[PDB]
């Protein structure tokens, strides 16, 4: 049940324009990354709420769902889209059921709750700029001096996770650049980690198995978490988990909660995305680019039975408890969009 069944593509552009403008920005990867998708997904629905007129609540939850179903097929793999939607849907039917009852409680039809949703939407937006700032503080219960740590590729959440510990504890981290797609940011992170007083070492992606033998913990940042606790993460992370489990090395995941999604990884081949081979082999090698098959995926699936701990804005939680974070944050009716 998408939106085009409700509103004509042209009148959508007049009623809620930013929606139609977002889909373009969403398919063209003008806005990628789960955070940038998340915050922009919210404040788009802000204007939507501030622009739709309606009478009964069942109009909204059927309307806002419909735009979401298209807002997903724009680029579905950027999961943070629906997660902001699915959370909004519960946000209204909670604000509904609380008001429909507190009015019944005032006893011996007022769709003017739009500004409450906006006060509820902006609440979740303000939570996003409060993702790392309340996650970085969990380090001092996990990072300790003289320990050896391994991560992979740029991940500011993990970056801020360590640097907070570096304030008082001195220790060492090991960085595996996320070749080919996380190369740039990963190098930068290590250069920043060095300033904070962290014996940081940059290694090729293939040097992972070698050094893990003397690694205490591995910290990882993901691109999203799926309904089975599995991980969709930027390329080359399974190399770390598989090398970790081979050494009984604990695996820790520092992720926000807006990436936690209930969609179930049915077929992986419809999850991973494939970027341009230009990041792997130069266009000049013309003989090769013709005679061969060149692929550059930039996601990676690691199964849930491989993560030992989840650092979230709500706290540390085993993977076998993620579901209770879902049902306390979403609604099973909104699994599919």
């Amino acid at each position: 049940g998408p939106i085009s069944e409700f509103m004509s593509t042209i009148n959508v552009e007049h009623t809620y324009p930013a929606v139609s403008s977002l889909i373009a920005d969403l398919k063209s990867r003008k806005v990628q990354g789960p955070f940038a998708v998340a915050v922009e997904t919210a404040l788009v629905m802000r204007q939507v709420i501030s622009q739709t007129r309606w009478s009964t609540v069942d109009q909204l939850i059927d309307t806002v769902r419909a735009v979401g179903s298209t807002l997903v097929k724009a680029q579905p793999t950027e999961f943070s889209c629906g997660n902001i939607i699915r959370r909004i849907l519960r946000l209204i039917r909670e604000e509904y059921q609380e008001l429909l009852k507190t009015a019944d409680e005032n006893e011996k039809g007022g769709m003017d709750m739009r500004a409450v949703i906006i006060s509820g939407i902006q609440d979740v937006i303000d939570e996003l700029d409060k993702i790392n700032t309340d996650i970085e503080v969990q380090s001092m219960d996990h990072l300790h001096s003289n320990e050896i740590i391994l991560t992979q590729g740029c991940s500011k959440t993990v970056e801020a996770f360590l640097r907070f510990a570096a304030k008082k504890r001195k220790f060492s981290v090991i960085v595996a650049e996320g070749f080919p797609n996380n190369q740039k940011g990963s190098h930068a992170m290590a250069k920043r980690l060095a300033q904070a007083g962290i014996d940081t070492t940059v290694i090729s992606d293939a040097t992972i198995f070698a050094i893990m033998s003397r690694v205490n913990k591995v910290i990882l940042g993901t691109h999203a978490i799926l309904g089975n606790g599995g991980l969709v993460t930027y390329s080359g992370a399974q190399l770390v988990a598989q090398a970790a489990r081979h050494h009984a090395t604990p695996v820790v995941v520092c992720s926000g909660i807006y990436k936690l999604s209930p969609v179930y990884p049915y077929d992986l081949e419809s999850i991973i995305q494939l970027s341009s081979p230009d990041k792997i082999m130069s266009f000049n090698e013309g003989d090769l680019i013709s005679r061969a098959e060149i692929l550059n995926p930039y996601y990676d699936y690691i199964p849930p039975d491989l993560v030992d701990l989840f650092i979230t804005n709500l706290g540390g939680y085993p993977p076998s408890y993620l579901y209770r974070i879902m049902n306390d944050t979403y609604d099973a009716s909104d699994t599919i969009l």
Binding site: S145, G316, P318, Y321
Partner: protein
């Protein structure tokens, strides 16, 4: 001074793994502050000097003592009871922690009582406030522990089968309280009692079960490989269950579970609910509590019997240090069941139960 000590407590993050574990213990009443209730003194002495001090009886004696503190409390005329009472109590904890670190059991009790003080109705009076939370405490001792124990033992003994060979380790009053039941309900079985150095806590378990007429077998932990071939079930009483499903009990508890699983015996964890913790531990070294190293100098089959050894000068010889951790964590892949008062749950289901009590709106 405290910040000066806090500077010291920073420098204790050096090459040694156990650099951070706190060794500072006060075992005497020298230089005690005045605001320390007598019944607290007698407790702090029992904490630092007792050894068969189960994590349950501690929480009880702590609460029963706390009643006597509150009962004798006297708020200043210029301030109601709720305001400026934790401050008094907080000044009691800081003493008790200096005798021996707070157990997980004791801690959550502090966190609970500190809460009910806050939510306490201001429009009451002293004798109204006091008489109230003394029941809250007595209720906490009723529902959270004593009754919960009686549920566990009955729930645990149900899975005891005639012909079993039970293995406990290092005297868990709960685990003793279930075997004695299974004896009195008519279950036909026998017990293996695994003990270990330095304070052989297992003998007192052997003493109890023997005085109840239970076939018992006593071996040190070094005989686990030898003795597990007869065992069919393993019963463990924990000091706490982590939120990841791990079990936080005494030292050998990890090996007991490990050696058992590699011989296909189940690890049954009997632990109450108030001993659940919102925290998690990847290694048995980040969060722990030490015992004095001197206790394993007197190498003999005794500990008080002052017969020396070769390591008596370890404190004075460089490149030599003795230590004895008191707890370690056991991964949940080794724990088979947790026997909370909500029934037999899988250990991984702990944090939900923790979040279940947070229904306190």
């Amino acid at each position: 001074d405290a910040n000066l000590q806090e500077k010291k407590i920073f420098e204790e993050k050096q090459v040694s793994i156990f650099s951070h574990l706190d060794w500072r213990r006060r075992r005497t009443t020298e230089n005690i502050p005045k605001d320390i209730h007598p019944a607290v003194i007698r407790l702090g002495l029992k904490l630092a000097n007792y050894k068969i001090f189960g994590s349950n009886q501690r929480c009880i004696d702590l609460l029963k003592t706390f009643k006597i503190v509150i009962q004798d409390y006297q708020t200043p005329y210029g301030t109601t009871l709720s305001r400026h009472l934790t401050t008094h109590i907080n000044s009691q904890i800081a003493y008790l922690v200096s005798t021996r670190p707070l157990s997980i059991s004791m801690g959550n009790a502090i966190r609970f009582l500190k809460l009910e003080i806050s939510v306490l109705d201001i429009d009451l009076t002293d004798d109204e406030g006091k008489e109230l939370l003394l029941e809250k405490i007595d209720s906490y001792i009723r529902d959270r522990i004593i009754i919960a124990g009686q549920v566990i033992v009955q729930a645990a003994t149900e899975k005891i089968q005639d012909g079993d060979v039970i293995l406990t380790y290092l005297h868990s009053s709960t685990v003793n309280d279930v075997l004695i039941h299974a004896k009195n309900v008519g279950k036909k079985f026998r017990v293996v009692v695994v003990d270990s150095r330095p304070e052989f806590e297992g003998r007192v378990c052997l003493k109890l079960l023997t005085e109840h007429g239970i076939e018992c077998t006593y071996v040190m932990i070094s005989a686990l490989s030898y003795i597990m071939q007869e065992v069919t079930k393993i019963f463990l009483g924990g000091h706490a269950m982590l939120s990841n499903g791990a079990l936080y009990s005494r030292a050998g508890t990890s090996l007991i579970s490990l050696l058992g699983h590699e011989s296909n015996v189940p690890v049954i964890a009997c632990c109450e609910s108030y001993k659940f913790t919102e925290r998690i531990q990847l290694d048995s070294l980040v969060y722990n509590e030490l015992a004095p190293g001197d206790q394993l100098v007197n190498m003999g089959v005794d500990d008080f019997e002052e017969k020396p050894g070769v390591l008596a000068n370890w404190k004075s010889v460089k490149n030599l240090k003795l230590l004895s951790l008191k707890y370690d964590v056991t991964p949940p892949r080794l724990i088979t069941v947790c026997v909370c008062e909500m029934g037999l749950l899988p250990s991984t289901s702990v944090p939900a139960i923790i979040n279940e009590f947070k229904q306190v709106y």
